Design an enzyme around this catalytic site. Structure first.
Site, PDB file in Angstrom:
ATOM      1  N   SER A   1      49.284  35.368  55.813  1.00 50.69           N
ATOM      2  CA  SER A   1      49.823  35.723  57.126  1.00 50.69           C
ATOM      3  C   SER A   1      51.340  35.664  57.203  1.00 50.69           C
ATOM      4  O   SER A   1      51.896  36.152  58.198  1.00 50.69           O
ATOM      5  CB  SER A   1      49.256  34.813  58.222  1.00 50.69           C
ATOM      6  OG  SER A   1      47.929  35.198  58.576  1.00 50.69           O
TER       7      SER A   1
ATOM      8  N   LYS B   1      53.077  38.918  57.950  1.00 47.86           N
ATOM      9  CA  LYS B   1      53.215  39.480  59.293  1.00 47.86           C
ATOM     10  C   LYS B   1      54.682  39.638  59.692  1.00 47.86           C
ATOM     11  O   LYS B   1      55.024  40.567  60.432  1.00 47.86           O
ATOM     12  CB  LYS B   1      52.502  38.613  60.335  1.00 47.86           C
ATOM     13  CG  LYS B   1      50.982  38.626  60.268  1.00 47.86           C
ATOM     14  CD  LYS B   1      50.432  37.864  61.472  1.00 47.86           C
ATOM     15  CE  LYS B   1      48.927  37.992  61.595  1.00 47.86           C
ATOM     16  NZ  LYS B   1      48.457  37.091  62.681  1.00 47.86           N
TER      17      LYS B   1
ATOM     18  N   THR C   1      52.949  30.387  59.777  1.00 44.94           N
ATOM     19  CA  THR C   1      51.956  29.828  58.870  1.00 44.94           C
ATOM     20  C   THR C   1      51.188  30.937  58.157  1.00 44.94           C
ATOM     21  O   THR C   1      51.173  32.103  58.574  1.00 44.94           O
ATOM     22  CB  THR C   1      50.956  28.933  59.607  1.00 44.94           C
ATOM     23  OG1 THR C   1      50.275  29.707  60.603  1.00 44.94           O
ATOM     24  CG2 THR C   1      51.638  27.738  60.269  1.00 44.94           C
TER      25      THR C   1
ATOM     26  N   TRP D   1      47.410  31.117  55.472  1.00 43.23           N
ATOM     27  CA  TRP D   1      46.361  30.424  54.732  1.00 43.23           C
ATOM     28  C   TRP D   1      45.498  31.496  54.096  1.00 43.23           C
ATOM     29  O   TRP D   1      44.817  32.244  54.804  1.00 43.23           O
ATOM     30  CB  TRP D   1      45.537  29.537  55.658  1.00 43.23           C
ATOM     31  CG  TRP D   1      44.545  28.621  55.000  1.00 43.23           C
ATOM     32  CD1 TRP D   1      43.993  28.725  53.751  1.00 43.23           C
ATOM     33  CD2 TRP D   1      43.957  27.464  55.602  1.00 43.23           C
ATOM     34  NE1 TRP D   1      43.105  27.690  53.538  1.00 43.23           N
ATOM     35  CE2 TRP D   1      43.073  26.905  54.662  1.00 43.23           C
ATOM     36  CE3 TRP D   1      44.108  26.839  56.849  1.00 43.23           C
ATOM     37  CZ2 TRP D   1      42.335  25.753  54.926  1.00 43.23           C
ATOM     38  CZ3 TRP D   1      43.370  25.690  57.115  1.00 43.23           C
ATOM     39  CH2 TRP D   1      42.495  25.160  56.156  1.00 43.23           C
TER      40      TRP D   1
ATOM     41  N   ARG E   1      49.839  21.499  57.598  1.00 44.76           N
ATOM     42  CA  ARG E   1      51.086  22.100  57.141  1.00 44.76           C
ATOM     43  C   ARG E   1      52.240  21.700  58.053  1.00 44.76           C
ATOM     44  O   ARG E   1      53.290  21.242  57.585  1.00 44.76           O
ATOM     45  CB  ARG E   1      50.927  23.615  57.074  1.00 44.76           C
ATOM     46  CG  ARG E   1      49.832  24.040  56.077  1.00 44.76           C
ATOM     47  CD  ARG E   1      49.365  25.461  56.314  1.00 44.76           C
ATOM     48  NE  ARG E   1      48.758  25.598  57.635  1.00 44.76           N
ATOM     49  CZ  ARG E   1      48.318  26.742  58.149  1.00 44.76           C
ATOM     50  NH1 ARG E   1      48.390  27.863  57.445  1.00 44.76           N
ATOM     51  NH2 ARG E   1      47.793  26.770  59.366  1.00 44.76           N
TER      52      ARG E   1
HETATM   53  C1  LIG Z   1      46.982  34.458  57.866  1.00 40.79           C
HETATM   54  O1  LIG Z   1      47.242  33.626  56.745  1.00 40.79           O
HETATM   55  C2  LIG Z   1      45.604  34.293  58.502  1.00 40.79           C
HETATM   56  C3  LIG Z   1      45.787  33.678  59.900  1.00 40.79           C
HETATM   57  N1  LIG Z   1      46.693  32.537  59.698  1.00 40.79           N
HETATM   58  C4  LIG Z   1      46.138  31.397  59.763  1.00 40.79           C
HETATM   59  C5  LIG Z   1      46.838  30.135  59.544  1.00 40.79           C
HETATM   60  O2  LIG Z   1      47.906  30.128  58.899  1.00 40.79           O
HETATM   61  O3  LIG Z   1      46.343  29.081  60.006  1.00 40.79           O
HETATM   62  C6  LIG Z   1      44.686  31.475  60.055  1.00 40.79           C
HETATM   63  S1  LIG Z   1      43.789  31.226  58.551  1.00 40.79           S
HETATM   64  C7  LIG Z   1      42.881  29.706  58.588  1.00 40.79           C
HETATM   65  C8  LIG Z   1      42.697  29.228  60.021  1.00 40.79           C
HETATM   66  N2  LIG Z   1      41.309  28.749  60.129  1.00 40.79           N
HETATM   67  C9  LIG Z   1      40.495  29.452  59.112  1.00 40.79           C
HETATM   68  C10 LIG Z   1      39.705  30.660  59.582  1.00 40.79           C
HETATM   69  O4  LIG Z   1      38.887  31.118  58.795  1.00 40.79           O
HETATM   70  N3  LIG Z   1      39.867  31.267  60.773  1.00 40.79           N
HETATM   71  C11 LIG Z   1      40.052  30.628  62.074  1.00 40.79           C
HETATM   72  C12 LIG Z   1      39.818  32.720  60.863  1.00 40.79           C
HETATM   73  C13 LIG Z   1      41.475  29.889  58.025  1.00 40.79           C
HETATM   74  C14 LIG Z   1      44.584  32.920  60.509  1.00 40.79           C
HETATM   75  C15 LIG Z   1      43.189  33.482  60.250  1.00 40.79           C
HETATM   76  C16 LIG Z   1      44.900  35.660  58.479  1.00 40.79           C
HETATM   77  C17 LIG Z   1      45.466  36.657  59.487  1.00 40.79           C
HETATM   78  O5  LIG Z   1      44.972  36.232  57.172  1.00 40.79           O
END
Ligand SMILES: *C(=O)[C@@H]([C@@H]1NC(C(=O)O)=C(S[C@H]2CN[C@@H](C(=O)N(C)C)C2)[C@@H]1C)[C@@H](C)O
Length: 230
Positions: A48, A51, A174, A176, A216
């Site tokens: 992410s 973005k 952030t 992930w 983080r």
């Molecule tokens: C970008 O890396 C993703 C976006 N960003 C992000 C984060 O940095 O926390 C979350 S991923 C992480 C949060 N909880 C887990 C999950 O599976 N979800 C709630 C969807 C993983 C968020 C999805 C993404 C846009 O690639």
């Protein structure tokens, strides 16, 4: 690019039983902290954090604007902090593979390779970037030194405000990547200190599924305080 005074911050990462690095860039100097300093020059998918560049490219090329409502209905800036709706996938498809690859090469972001799928190359590859490259990118954004419109850079910076405390502004993004192994976690951004000075950072660590996303931010804030950056 030098190891900093790392005695304490190394232990912060140790207590979470994972490997991480924190890259700090001030004017000219880059310092490395954490318990896995080789991560700083290792390439990872940006997830992410891309973005930020997606937004710059989309706004610069007038594929969207900061007031457009993406059908909860959301703006580009609201979608920067939340991923309830696939705004940035939609924006990437508007940009298209040709323009995206040209812009990513012009910026020189990471390995600058986006492959053939314009709407997921930042999450599972082939695009990869080191933490040192990310801190250099976000330092340029913070200083309005990327080769984009000044107004576009200001508009994207305004989307990245995370916290404000006693005159310090903390900007960042952030990421992930949870579907690759090992998982990669990012927190990349900068501190605007009260007198205007900018200190850029890139935190990069191995994630595991049981961790809270806030790990983080926790590691970042404790480290920035230990370094007297906030
Ligand atoms: C970008 O890396 C993703 C976006 N960003 C992000 C984060 O940095 O926390 C979350 S991923 C992480 C949060 N909880 C887990 C999950 O599976 N979800 C709630 C969807 C993983 C968020 C999805 C993404 C846009 O690639």
């Amino acid at each position: 690019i030098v190891q900093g005074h790392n005695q304490v911050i190394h232990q912060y990462f140790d207590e979470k039983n994972t490997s991480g690095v924190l890259v700090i860039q001030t004017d000219k100097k880059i310092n490395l902290y954490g318990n896995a300093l080789s991560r700083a020059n290792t390439e990872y998918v940006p997830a992410s954090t891309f973005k930020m560049l997606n937004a710059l490219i989309g706004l610069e090329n007038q594929k969207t604007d900061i007031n457009e409502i993406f059908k909860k209905d959301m703006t580009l800036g609201e979608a920067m902090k939340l991923s309830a709706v696939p705004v940035y996938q939609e924006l990437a498809r508007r940009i298209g593979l040709d323009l995206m690859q040209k812009e990513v090469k012009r910026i020189g972001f990471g390995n600058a390779e986006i492959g053939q799928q314009v709407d997921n190359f930042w999450l599972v590859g082939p695009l990869k970037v080191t933490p040192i490259q990310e801190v250099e990118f976000v330092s340029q954004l913070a200083h309005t030194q990327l080769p984009f419109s000044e107004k576009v850079q200001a508009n994207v910076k305004n989307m990245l405000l995370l916290e404000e405390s006693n005159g310090y502004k903390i900007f960042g993004k952030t990421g992930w990547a949870a579907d690759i192994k090992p998982q990669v976690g990012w927190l990349t951004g900068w501190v605007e200190q009260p007198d205007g000075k900018i200190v850029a950072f890139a935190l990069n660590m191995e994630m595991r599924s049981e961790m809270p996303a806030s790990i983080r931010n926790e590691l970042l804030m404790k480290s920035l305080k230990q370094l007297n950056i906030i």
